[PDB]
From a paper:
To further understand this dynamic protein-interaction module, we obtained a crystal of the [name] [name] domain which had a calculated Matthews coefficient (V M) of 2.76 Å3 Da−1, corresponding to a solvent content of 55.43%, and solved the structure at a resolution of 3.0 Å. The final model contained residues 117–193 for all nine molecules.
The cell-death-inducing DFF45-like effector ([name]) domain is a protein-interaction module comprising ∼80 amino acids and was initially identified in several apoptotic nucleases and their regulators. [name] is a [name]-domain-containing protein in Drosophila and has been suggested to be a regulator of nucleases. Unlike proteins harbouring the [name] domain at the N-terminus, the [name] [name] domain is located in the middle of the protein.
Residue numbers in the entry: 117 to 193
The structure:
């Protein structure tokens, strides 16, 4: 294995952290942390979507993520 991760909402005002070993785990825990359903994980810096375990395994510890929920889109600045 597990690693720490930072996840924010798209406006970057809700700033939270999760410990996870798989993308399935991070998604469940991010829903519990944000109290919102069907989290989609994107990179904070560039909006890249993380939707397979292979790319999730390449992520560094304490990588900065954005949680984009249904009806939302990742925002740039």
């Amino acid at each position: 294995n597990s690693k720490p991760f930072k996840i924010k909402d798209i406006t970057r005002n809700i700033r939270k952290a999760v410990v996870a070993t798989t993308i399935s785990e991070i998604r469940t825990k991010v829903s519990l942390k944000f109290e919102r359903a069907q989290r989609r994980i994107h990179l904070d810096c560039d909006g890249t979507e993380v939707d397979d375990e292979e790319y999730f395994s390449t992520l560094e510890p304490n990588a900065e993520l954005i949680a984009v929920f249904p009806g939302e889109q990742w925002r740039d600045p």
